Design a protein around this nucleic acid. Structure first.
Ligand SMILES: [Mg+2]
Ligand SMILES: [Mg+2]
Ligand SMILES: [Mg+2]
Ligand SMILES: [Mg+2]
Ligand SMILES: [Mg+2]
Ligand SMILES: [Mg+2]
Ligand SMILES: [Mg+2]
Ligand SMILES: [Mg+2]
Ligand SMILES: [Mg+2]
Ligand SMILES: [Mg+2]
Ligand SMILES: [Mg+2]
Ligand SMILES: [Mg+2]
Ligand SMILES: [Mg+2]
Ligand SMILES: [Mg+2]
Ligand SMILES: [Mg+2]
Ligand SMILES: [Mg+2]
Ligand SMILES: [Mg+2]
Ligand SMILES: [Mg+2]
Ligand SMILES: [Mg+2]
Ligand SMILES: [Mg+2]
Ligand SMILES: [Mg+2]
Ligand SMILES: [Mg+2]
Ligand SMILES: [Mg+2]
Ligand SMILES: [Mg+2]
Ligand SMILES: [Mg+2]
Ligand SMILES: [Mg+2]
Ligand SMILES: [Mg+2]
Ligand SMILES: [Mg+2]
Ligand SMILES: [Mg+2]
Ligand SMILES: [Mg+2]
Ligand SMILES: [Mg+2]
Ligand SMILES: [Mg+2]
Lengths: 343, 328, 132, 206, 177
RNA sequence: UUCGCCAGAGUACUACUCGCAACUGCCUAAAACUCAAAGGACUUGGCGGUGCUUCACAUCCACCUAGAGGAGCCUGUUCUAUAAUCGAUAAACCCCGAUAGACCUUACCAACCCUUGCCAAUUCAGCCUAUAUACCGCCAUCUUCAGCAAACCCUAAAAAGGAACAAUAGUAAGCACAAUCAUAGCACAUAAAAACGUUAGGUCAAGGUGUAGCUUAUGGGUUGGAAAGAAAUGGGCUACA
RNA sequence: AUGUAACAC
């Protein structure tokens, strides 16, 4: 019956059934778990259960300059060496059954908010350890093919940011989740924005926009109260370096639309230097905690205009009913004043 | 990979010296066919693929021709068409169009001076000229091309070659010209053999459907054929087979002027008759002049019959017929 | 589909040896025979005993060089002496190579009652013909 | 097809080659033929440059043959021509001078005239229109007309002959009946013509 | 095109007339930028997808010592440079488009690809072209052979003057120490 | 700047009111009850007894030859029938595992027997026990169809798609096709090959095996038996001259 | 003309 048996590669390939039709379409994962263990790991080649001690395999050739004889250990030494082998086997089992803890971003099972570390280095030898990348959406997307029928393609959307004001977003789609992760990480460094931050913590002015069917309204805040935003906006603002913001999103809360509209709104941001240059007038910041002191934050380079601004008695500005309702104290919603966790 | 090529060249020379040493021949006259029979003797692979046999040749012939380095140490490209993606092919089209423009300018100057000293040398048909194959042009340009680019380059070459010709431009064109071998279907006429005071006897071999026929014919006798020691009438009772024995002699109007004897083996009666017919046709070429040999060729006597019985296929009955296929 | 003695097409990363990279209809066309012996000729006897000896040699060398055996053996029969030709990786010490060589020589000589040669070539890794 | 597409059909007739110098265009045709270096097929086993063969005789013998017995079909054709010749000789010997001048004794011309009066002129095809099959008259190709004549001859003399009457004498009798235009194959051709005129109005469906 | 109204002087019987005061004001800056980028040892690429002058652009670049792509621009050439050209490839530092339109009257691909790859450009824009993506446009005529030959001659003398002056100031630096 | 409308879907252009020359009518118009969706626009396959071109080369018709289905016999199934195997069972089953059953093969049945019971050893052997919907090994089919696919790049977002040669975003290592090889000289033809995948297609009974079941029995040996045709059908052989 | 009723990423 010695000719009947086979090779361990054939045995493991028949055992785990990785090429079967169950795992092909997606029919598997109902009651399917097979583990492959290399049985040639802890072999000392000349080790045997009878315990013969060989002059070339187990023990060396020469002792005290003389030639060793073929010998056998004692039976007590045999259960000692067998005990060492089996204790190595439960040591391997103890190392194998240990699972690494997965850090949760937003929820226990979702991939939103999970970081993947620094992005991969480029072809020029450039290395980026200061950036961090975060997943905002994972979504299994299916396709209909002539042969395979359903074709599952995982697409993911990630953001990169170093915390110094440079950030970007991308999408990556592949058959395998890790391949989609790698593609999204390599594609996110190609598309980068610079986001101007007023005193490196908050944005310059209040920004309200509607990108496609997503309404994004972000508001400027002082130093002490930080990041009252939707969780994707909190992740993006943490990767940018924005520590204080208010954000309200209305309509569709689609992740890609929200990210595109957010980056468009923060890239259409107008700085005080640009405002002073386009108006040729001084801009003065009137802090409420500093009293009536006229802090000048930007000055118009070039010719300063001597003509004052036309003072309109009733300004023509577009007001939002939610903002006026919040200002007048008619917002009695129980969710607005909720105390929440840290940033 | 240039240093790899130089290493292959030098160890090929050293191995050539060891091969001449181990054969005991003259290493200065030791040549490539000597290398071929040397390797075929020392490592005799019987393999049906001729490229899978052991070889040791010039590393330039074995290794494919490689692209050189395309830029300096500063990053600046050496050639001014590197950013087109295909620098060598487009430089070739550039040189061809420059030669065509120079030909047009020189021909306009010659028209202004009222002189036509050039001649049309495009017709190299007696040499049997053909242009380069796309594979050969890829090998010359050391780069992959496409059929549309190849057709564009060949029609530009035709545009250049249909103009009045300068010597430099003809030398440019003749790099891309290839010559065919000799195209001829004329057979080799076997000379007549004279043996032991016998005049004008000829020999012929015929093969048709396992039947092999030797036919030897004398022009000095009357009309009779002796097949395998017996008379042709006794050997071939079939009137159709006797017509097959007739057919070349009635085609050449020489029915009674030849005495034949024959030796045919294998097959049946019609296969033997066809083999004898082909063997008489091939044996009669010595007596018969050249235009009537071509008349024999378009009569179809001299061409062997390739119709051989096919092999029975597995799962089938008679090499075409399959079993009865039931729809349900 | 024909599945005998073929490696399947993966994503493009599996290394393959020349013998595993050719289908069985390339035998005596592009690749050769791993065993050469007399008994498979036209009017010659004793093929089955050579066949079972061939099988037992393949399993014994596969288990005698565990993991350090690269690929399939070459088994030559020439006037009752049996030459076993191997590609072995540089895994075990040469002490252990020579121990297993002398052991296999004496054991197979006394087991098939014929003189045996063990010829080895020891390589850094598995020789890759395609893919990778 | 062991012959390639470059191979052509051989020319067998000796008088095409033996008198070439009286005309120009067929000359130019055959120097094109042997100056294109064109491959010629081998001569077929049936066709031969003999002047005593005849091609419609060869085709009729090929349709005479059942299985693979060429010599049996040629023997049946031989006794058929023998029976036609000896029947015409017996009719010649029993007549007067004007009938002896009238009677033709050559079985080759008898066979040719029998098939020329035997071939149908028009044919029928089935065409599906509106979920029904309709018979529509069509002009037939010359090879199809000759084929239908041959097939009708073999079909009649194979089917409605008696077991005791022999095949060549039966086909000789039917050859003489088709020569005198009173045969049942001639009646079948006329019946096909009846069906063709009955379906004349359907000829616009083609 | 709607972006050519500030660059148009007017219309003469339905034909657009380009203001050559503005063309000269743009062309001085464009030639000066080309001379400086040739002085600082940069890679300069001439692109013109037009099969009436293509040999003349190619010979112009051959005499300049700079590179030309007047043939079909492959899609991922400037963008996916390492797969098309080689393992390590230094991207072009400047592109001159003599014709910003291709044969099917679309704007050229390499303008958009240079805008993606942050590669500056000098483009001759006609009255139907797009000067929005071009950092240094010159409103001019790219169809008439005297205009095309004059633009090639000015870029020739600009490149030659820049490289020779780079050589002389390099020799002056060498004789300084 | 105004006016009329819109508060999930079905119930519902409905029940009950007001008004009307309308009396099987029109307008206005809910609720009880049920569900977690009802919907609008797209992307890619699939399909079409939808239309237009080019075709089919033993393939559809026109058309050629020889057969089957009718008879006898051989052989394989389906049904009944016995104490008396199993598998296949649309194309891709049906002289198929079997290039092969009087005992043996034999795994079936009836009587009897043996339980560290092939091996150097094993609180162990051994199982033709179940799952081919766990598999490997070997194949069928689309199929002599040409596509599959790693790694990149682009799209005013990206479900996905990626071509214009006087070229408008595609490069692409590789696998198939092709090329090469065999039928002892070319050529043709045949053979061989034919990727990724589809049919959870066939095979735990070539062999090994994961999982689930036995261990004085679902295991191991001896003897004797495996019928048969009420019927139907497939493939062949011999004929009907 | 039709082919009901237990598919999982
Ligand atoms: Mg949880
Ligand atoms: Mg047959
Ligand atoms: Mg223009
Ligand atoms: Mg409701
Ligand atoms: Mg209504
Ligand atoms: Mg109503
Ligand atoms: Mg009511
Ligand atoms: Mg058919
Ligand atoms: Mg029959
Ligand atoms: Mg029948
Ligand atoms: Mg029957
Ligand atoms: Mg039966
Ligand atoms: Mg059965
Ligand atoms: Mg079973
Ligand atoms: Mg069954
Ligand atoms: Mg089936
Ligand atoms: Mg028994
Ligand atoms: Mg039995
Ligand atoms: Mg059993
Ligand atoms: Mg299956
Ligand atoms: Mg089954
Ligand atoms: Mg292809
Ligand atoms: Mg795609
Ligand atoms: Mg590829
Ligand atoms: Mg060959
Ligand atoms: Mg071929
Ligand atoms: Mg085959
Ligand atoms: Mg092939
Ligand atoms: Mg199944
Ligand atoms: Mg089993
Ligand atoms: Mg069968
Ligand atoms: Mg129904």
């Amino acid at each position: 019956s010695f000719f009947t048996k086979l090779t361990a590669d054939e045995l493991w390939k028949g055992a785990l059934a990785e090429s079967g039709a169950g795992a092909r379409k997606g029919r598997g994962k109902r009651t399917k778990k097979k583990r492959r263990k290399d049985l040639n790991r802890g072999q000392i080649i000349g080790e045997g259960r009878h315990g013969f001690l060989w002059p070339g395999l187990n023990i060396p050739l020469m002792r005290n300059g003389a030639v060793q004889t073929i010998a056998q250990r004692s039976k007590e030494d045999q259960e000692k060496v067998e005990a060492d082998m089996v204790q190595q086997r439960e040591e391997w089992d103890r190392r194998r059954k240990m699972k690494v803890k997965r850090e949760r971003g937003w929820s226990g099972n979702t991939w939103g908010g999970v970081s993947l570390g620094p992005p991969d280095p480029g072809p020029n030898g450039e290395t980026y350890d200061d950036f961090d990348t975060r997943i905002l959406e994972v979504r299994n997307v299916f396709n209909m093919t002539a042969k395979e029928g359903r074709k599952r393609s995982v697409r993911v959307l990630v953001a990169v940011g170093n915390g110094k004001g440079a950030a970007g977003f991308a999408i990556g789609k592949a058959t395998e989740r890790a391949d989609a992760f790698r593609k999204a990480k390599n594609r996110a460094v190609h598309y980068l924005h610079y986001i101007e931050r007023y005193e490196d913590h908050t944005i310059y002015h209040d920004i309200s926009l509607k990108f496609k069917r997503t309404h994004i309204k972000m508001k400027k805040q002082p130093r002490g109260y930080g990041l009252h935003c939707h969780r994707a906006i909190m992740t993006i603002c943490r990767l940018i370096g924005i520590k204080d913001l208010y954000a309200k999103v209305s309509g569709s809360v689609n992740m890609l639309n929200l990210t595109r509209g957010l980056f468009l709104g923060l890239s259409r941001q107008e700085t005080h230097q640009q405002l002073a240059d386009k108006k040729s007038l001084h801009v003065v910041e009137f802090r409420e905690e500093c009293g009536p002191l006229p802090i000048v934050v930007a000055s118009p380079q070039g010719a300063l205009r001597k003509d004052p601004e036309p003072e309109d008695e009733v300004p023509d500005i577009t007001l939002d009913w939610e903002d006026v309702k919040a200002a007048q104290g008619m917002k009695r919603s129980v969710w607005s004043g909720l105390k929440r966790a840290a940033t | 990979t240039v240093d790899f090529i130089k290493k292959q060249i030098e160890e090929f020379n050293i191995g050539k010296r060891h091969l001449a040493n181990m054969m005991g021949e003259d290493p200065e006259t030791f040549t490539q066919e000597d290398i071929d029979r040397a390797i075929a003797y020392l490592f005799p692979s019987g393999l049906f693929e001729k490229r899978a046999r052991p070889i040791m040749k010039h590393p330039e012939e074995i290794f494919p021709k490689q692209r050189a380095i395309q830029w300096g140490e500063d990053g600046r490209p050496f050639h001014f068409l590197f950013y087109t993606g295909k620098q060598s092919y487009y430089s070739l089209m550039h040189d061809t169009y420059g030669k065509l423009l120079d030909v047009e300018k020189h021909h306009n100057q010659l028209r202004a001076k009222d002189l036509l000293a050039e001649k049309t040398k495009i017709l190299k048909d007696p040499i049997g000229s053909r242009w380069l194959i796309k594979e050969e042009l890829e090998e010359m340009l050391v780069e992959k091309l496409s059929d549309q680019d190849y057709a564009q380059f060949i029609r530009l070459l035709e545009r250049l070659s249909a103009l009045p010709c300068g010597a430099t431009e003809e030398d440019f064109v003749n790099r891309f010209r290839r010559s065919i071998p000799i195209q001829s279907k004329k057979q080799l006429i076997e000379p007549l053999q004279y043996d032991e005071q016998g005049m004008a006897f000829s020999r012929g071999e015929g093969k048709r459907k396992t039947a092999k026929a030797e036919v030897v014919v004398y022009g000095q006798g009357s009309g009779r054929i002796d097949v395998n020691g017996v008379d042709y009438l006794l050997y071939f009772p079939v009137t159709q087979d006797r017509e097959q024995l007739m057919f070349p002699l009635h085609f050449l109007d020489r029915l009674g002027k030849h005495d034949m004897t024959c030796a045919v083996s294998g097959g049946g009666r019609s296969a033997q008759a066809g083999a004898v017919r082909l063997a008489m046709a091939r044996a009669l070429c010595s007596f018969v002049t050249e235009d009537e040999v071509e008349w024999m060729r378009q009569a179809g006597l001299l061409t062997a019959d390739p119709r051989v019985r096919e092999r029975k296929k597995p799962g089938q009955e008679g090499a075409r017929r399959k079993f009865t296929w039931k729809k349900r | 589909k024909n599945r005998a003695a073929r490696v399947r097409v993966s994503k493009g990363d599996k290394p393959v040896t020349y013998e595993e990279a050719h289908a069985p209809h390339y035998i005596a066309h592009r690749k050769g025979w791993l065993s050469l012996h007399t008994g498979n000729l036209d009017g010659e006897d004793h093929a089955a005993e050579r066949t079972v000896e061939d099988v037992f040699l393949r399993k014994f060398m596969l288990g005698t060089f565990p993991g350090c055996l690269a690929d399939q053996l070459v088994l030559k029969r020439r006037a009752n002496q049996l030459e076993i030709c191997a590609l072995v990786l540089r895994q075990l010490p040469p002490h252990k190579f020579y121990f297993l060589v002398g052991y296999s020589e004496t054991l197979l000589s006394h087991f098939y009652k014929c003189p045996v040669h063990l010829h080895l070539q020891t390589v850094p890794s598995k020789v890759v013909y395609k893919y990778i | 097809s062991r012959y390639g597409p470059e191979y052509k059909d051989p020319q067998i007739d000796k008088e095409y080659y033996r008198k070439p110098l009286a005309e120009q265009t067929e000359e130019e045709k055959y120097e094109r033929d042997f100056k294109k270096t064109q491959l010629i097929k081998a001569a077929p086993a049936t066709k031969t440059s003999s002047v005593f063969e005849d091609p419609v005789i060869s085709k009729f013998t090929n349709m005479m043959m059942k299985g693979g017995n060429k010599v049996l079909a040629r023997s049946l054709m031989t006794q058929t021509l023998e029976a036609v010749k000896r029947k015409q000789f017996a009719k010649y010997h029993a007549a007067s001078a004007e009938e002896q001048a009238t009677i033709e004794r050559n079985p080759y011309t008898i066979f040719h005239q029998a098939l020329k009066n035997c071939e149908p002129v028009i044919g029928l095809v089935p065409i599906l229109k509106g979920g029904h099959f309709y018979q529509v008259p069509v002009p037939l190709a010359d090879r199809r007309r000759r084929f239908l004549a041959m097939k009708w001859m073999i079909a009649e003399c194979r089917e409605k002959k008696h077991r005791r009457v022999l095949m060549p004498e039966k086909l000789s009798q039917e050859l003489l009946e088709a020569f005198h235009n009173q045969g049942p194959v001639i009646k079948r051709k006329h019946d096909m013509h009846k069906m063709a005129e009955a379906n004349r109005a359907l000829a616009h469906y083609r | 095109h709607r972006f050519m109204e500030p660059y148009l002087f007017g219309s003469r019987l339905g034909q657009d007339i380009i203001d050559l005061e503005q063309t000269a004001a743009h062309l001085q800056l464009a030639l000066n930028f080309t001379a400086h980028v040739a002085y600082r040892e940069g890679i300069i690429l001439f692109v013109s997808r037009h099969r009436q002058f293509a040999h003349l652009i190619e010979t112009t670049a051959r005499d300049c010592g700079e590179y030309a792509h007047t043939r079909y621009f492959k899609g991922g050439l400037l963008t996916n440079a390492p797969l098309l050209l080689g393992p390590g490839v230094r991207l072009p530092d400047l592109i001159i488009f003599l014709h910003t339109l291709n044969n099917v009257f679309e704007p050229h691909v390499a303008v958009r690809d240079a805008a993606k790859m942050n590669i500056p450009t000098v483009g001759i824009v006609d009255t139907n072209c797009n000067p929005a993506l071009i950092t240094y446009p010159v409103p001019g005529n790219d169809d008439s052979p005297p205009a095309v030959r004059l633009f090639c001659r000015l870029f020739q003398v600009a490149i030659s003057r820049a490289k020779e002056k780079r050589r002389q100031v390099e020799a002056l630096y060498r004789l300084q120490g």
